[PDB]
């Protein structure tokens, strides 16, 4: 019901409110954000509810509050390769990941849940997705914000994948279960995968190519054998890169 998982992060309300204030103070934003209203919309999603009975509609006021005008042709999805995807967006700073948006920035690496009959936050334990229930506050949030993120994408979407994993593309991950199935074909022309270390011939990548192609979206794939060199030339493309993109 509420156990088997880590509890809500200590000082979670202060943290969410502090993150919103800092995100807005470094992003003169589409529409002024009253961070207090944002925290209230966050709280209203899960407070005083069964933490196994959370729905996506519970989070829609927070989603509406947190809608941002993101350049849709600059979205980098990723699946289970966290550090390189975000360091890539620190350099190619015209491209965004889900954690670079307001809503992703707010909840990144946090846990939360409430209790049915009380207005309190449970800092002791929260429903674990696998062993208690799937419709818990944290999982439902990310399942919701990731769907809307994919729905906003346009013109060419890139996704970074870990080629060292035995399942380079996992159909059961958020990218496979939610994001891929929600790219709008009338807005998205191509999904280009970047496999990080020829693994574009891996059975799981061809599965991603099949799934995407039957939604009438083009598939593209690109091996990256030299990640550190690939990033070095994103910083400064002017030294030695048009001959060194080869199998190391």
């Amino acid at each position, epitope marked *: 019901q509420q156990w088997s998982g880590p509890g809500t992060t200590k000082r979670f309300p202060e943290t969410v409110l502090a993150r919103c204030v800092k995100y807005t103070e470094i992003h003169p934003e589409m529409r002024h954000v009253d961070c207090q209203s944002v925290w209230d919309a966050f709280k209203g999603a899960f407070i005083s509810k069964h933490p196994c009975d959370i729905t996506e509609e519970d989070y829609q006021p927070l989603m509406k509050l947190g809608t941002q005008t993101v350049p849709c042709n600059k979205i980098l999805l990723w699946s289970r390769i966290k550090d390189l995807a975000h360091q890539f967006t620190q350099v190619q700073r015209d491209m965004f990941t889900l954690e670079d948006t307001l809503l992703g920035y707010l909840a990144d690496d946090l846990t939360w849940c409430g209790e049915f009959a009380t207005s309190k936050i449970n800092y002791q334990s929260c429903p674990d997705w696998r062993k208690d229930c799937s419709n818990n506050p944290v999982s439902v949030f990310w399942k919701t914000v990731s769907r809307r993120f994919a729905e906003a994408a346009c013109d060419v979407v*890139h996704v970074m994948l870990d080629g060292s994993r035995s399942k380079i593309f996992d159909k059961d991950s958020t990218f496979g279960s939610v994001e891929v199935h929600n790219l709008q074909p009338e807005k998205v022309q191509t999904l280009e995968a970047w496999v990080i270390h020829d693994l574009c011939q891996d059975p799981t990548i061809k599965e991603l190519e099949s799934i995407i192609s039957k939604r009438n979206i*083009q598939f*593209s*794939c690109k091996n990256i054998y030299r990640p550190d060199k690939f990033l070095q030339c994103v910083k400064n*493309p002017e030294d030695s890169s*048009c001959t060194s*993109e080869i199998g190391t």
Partner: antibody
Amino acid sequence: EVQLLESGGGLVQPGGSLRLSCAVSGFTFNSFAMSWVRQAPGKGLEWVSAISGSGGGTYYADSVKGRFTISRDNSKNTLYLQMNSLRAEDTAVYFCAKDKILWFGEPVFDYWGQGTLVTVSS
Amino acid sequence: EIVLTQSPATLSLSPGERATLSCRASQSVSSYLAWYQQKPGQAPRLLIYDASNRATGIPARFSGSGSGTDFTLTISSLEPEDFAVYYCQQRSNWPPTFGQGTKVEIKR
């Protein structure tokens, strides 16, 4: 060093077909998007079509959207432009261009071929 | 599509003079603006990309400035060898578009 060498092209009747080739060397063809840019006689540059490094993703200019097909054979380092239903207004010098960006998207071109003239005439 | 307007159509300068070339986008491309040099009978040569970055091997007399809709190419110490048509090209969205070009002719 990088080299883009276009072949094919010449004289073709209105309504006929022509396939262009672009043989490349000096870079990893697989990991770069390619595009075709054309230049009518005494006119400016007009982007025709773009294709991803692996070939799956393609974009087309509206004027050729139903008649041109971009493609590539990465095992031969060759780019193709399959042109059908050619009209007089397709008469132009056709360049192949290499995307400078390290991924598929709105391109900027750092390497060009020498171009090959296509004449659509009776 | 995004329309790129270059002014003037022709510019006749003397060597050693400063060349100022304009490109005005019909809507904001914000940085995604390249500059290309095309000498007679030749393929274009990328001078500036993303509105301010010199490509490899491009002389320091070529400089790009601008953001949004107003962009400028400057050639500080013009040479007879600089007789070419210069094109601006945007990569803000699809399709990528070029301006009609400015022809720099050298006085003598």
